[PDB]
Design a protein around this ligand. Structure first.
Ligand SMILES: COc1cc(Br)ccc1CO
Length: 119
């Protein structure tokens, strides 16, 4: 029932994500010189370095907020892809499956800890 445990669990999951080859297109903001129309489609850019920095700055109050930003990385890739068969989008789908598989217990434990705190 540790209300704070999610933070280190998210730091470790982000470390695993950065070790994965599939995260390379998502480690830093999308390069606007390479993709000049990016901001015509994507309203809110997001990347894993921004997520990690927000977490380390103490600017996430819960793992749900972190999860919303990571999911935004994936929805931006889906929205920007010209094809569902594109390389970068395909990498995003595998990374999303890995992220969802690992964030589930982090969210469950945090929500359970909060419920115990308010019992
Ligand atoms: C299952 O192995 C994966 C896959 C992805 Br994508 C991201 C990280 C890991 C962990 O090394």
């Amino acid at each position: 029932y540790d209300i704070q445990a999610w933070k280190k669990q998210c730091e470790e999951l982000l470390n695993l994500i950065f070790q994965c080859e599939d995260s390379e297109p998502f480690r830093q903001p999308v390069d606007l010189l390479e993709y000049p129309d990016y901001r015509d489609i994507i309203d809110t850019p997001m990347d894993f370095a921004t997520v990690r920095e927000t977490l380390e700055a103490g600017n996430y109050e819960s793992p749900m907020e972190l999860c919303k930003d990571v999911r935004l990385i994936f929805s931006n890739s889906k929205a920007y892809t010209p094809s569902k068969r594109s390389r970068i989008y395909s990498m995003s789908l595998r990374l999303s499956a890995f992220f969802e598989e690992h964030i589930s217990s982090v969210l469950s434990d945090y929500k359970s800890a909060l419920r115990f705190h308010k019992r």
